Amino acid sequence: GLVPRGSHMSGATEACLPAGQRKSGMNINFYQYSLKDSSTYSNAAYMAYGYASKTKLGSVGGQTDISIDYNIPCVSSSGTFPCPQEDSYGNWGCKGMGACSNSQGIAYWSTDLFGFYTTPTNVTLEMTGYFLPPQTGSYTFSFATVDDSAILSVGGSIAFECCAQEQPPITSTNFTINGIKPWDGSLPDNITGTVYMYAGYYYPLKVVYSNAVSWGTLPISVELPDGTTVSDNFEGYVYSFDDDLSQSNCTIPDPSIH
């Protein structure tokens, strides 16, 4: 027919067309999270919005390299160097450094997380921005692994509301990737979620990430409709806009018919 019929039962993901000045990269907000608290981040409500009820520590904007790979220090015979988790051994040492004198179980201060000076051993962060598909089709987002707890949400009224990136978080627990740390046990690696996206619309994107102890890890990728994979560096794909709650036409509830 003259027009497409639309995704079945309004199934299209909501997207946005913000009219303001586009900024490269995502905004990162940092919130307090307690060292060795292995229970708070196991709740869907906390990971969707509850994190923002705790003290906000600070923020950084314009971040395009969004994967997390935080390594604790090994205080070694030859100085203090970050230890890759797979190189830690015993009680404890780091391969190529010998025995480490420092505890794995205390807070450590570092700018490793997006240049913001904080405790990557124990913190919760929220990444917000808009994903711009250059190609129409199915996109598969993935976390290679999650240490400790994380979610990824895509879509208007799922990640956040259109033209309202900076507002308090919305309550949706309809996660695109549920990487919430289970009450007992661990999640597989390569946890994934797929979204069908229309080229040139801006899709709200939220990642909430938490760590309680020592190493923190969140390697983020997306597989494009063309079968190629973008990992870590999302430059050219992720953007921010200042709130404009007055832009009436900003929400596109169904990009398949717009």
Under DSSP, the state recorded for 245 is T
Q: Cα dist. 228→66, 88, 136, 221 in Å?
A: 18, 33, 14, 10
Interacting span for Gd ion (CB under 5 A) from 27-35, 51-59, 79-87, 201-209: 79-87
82 binds, among Gd ion, Cl ion, none (CB under 5 to 8 A by kind): Cl ion
**Encoding tokens for residue 70?**
């935080």
Does 219 participate in binding Cl ion (rule CB under 5 A)? Answer: no
Does 107 participate in binding Cl ion (rule CB under 5 A)? Answer: no
Residues 134-153 that bind Cl ion (CB under 5 A): none
Q: How far is the CB of 36 from Cl ion (least distance, A)?
A: 20
Q: Could you give the CA distance from residue 31 to residue 204 in angstroms, rounded to a whole number?
A: 21
Contact assessment for residue 197 and residue 13, using Cβ atoms and an 8 Å cutoff: yes
Q: Could you give the CA distance from residue 47 to residue 49 in angstroms, rounded to a whole number?
A: 6
**Encoding tokens for residue 35?**
């060292």
Does 62 participate in binding Cl ion (rule CB under 5 A)? Answer: no
Does 242 participate in binding Gd ion (rule CB under 5 A)? Answer: yes
Taking alpha carbons only, the member of 163, 63, 71 closest to residue 120 is: 71
Q: Could you give the CA distance from residue 227 to residue 230 in angstroms, rounded to a whole number?
A: 10
Residues 93-122 that bind Gd ion (CB under 5 A): 112
**Encoding tokens for residue 4?**
């497409």
Pick between residue 37 and residue 112 the one whose CB is nearest to Gd ion.
112
Does 226 participate in binding Gd ion (rule CB under 5 A)? Answer: no
Pick between residue 117 and residue 235 the one whose CB is nearest to Cl ion.
117
73 binds, among Cl ion, Gd ion, none (CB under 5 to 8 A by kind): Cl ion
Contact assessment for residue 97 and residue 76, using Cβ atoms and an 8 Å cutoff: yes
Which residues have C-beta within 8 Å of that of residue 200, sequence separation ≥ 6?
A: 132, 133
Q: Which of 82, 219, 225, 253 binds Cl ion (CB under 5 A)?
A: 82
Does 73 participate in binding Cl ion (rule CB under 5 A)? Answer: yes
- Find the residue with minimal CB distance to Cl ion: 73
Give the count of residues interacting with Gd ion (CB under 5 A). Answer: 14
Q: How far is the CB of 2 from Gd ion (least distance, A)?
A: 29
Does 112 participate in binding Cl ion (rule CB under 5 A)? Answer: no
Does 61 participate in binding Cl ion (rule CB under 5 A)? Answer: no
Total length of the chain: 258
Q: Cα dist. 102→11, 93, 97, 108, 205 in Å?
A: 52, 10, 13, 11, 38
Pick between residue 98 and residue 168 the one whose CB is nearest to Cl ion.
98
Q: Which residues bind Gd ion (CB under 5 A)?
A: 65, 67, 69, 84, 112, 147-148, 157, 211, 213, 215, 227, 232, 242
Q: Which residues bind Cl ion (CB under 5 A)?
A: 73, 82, 98
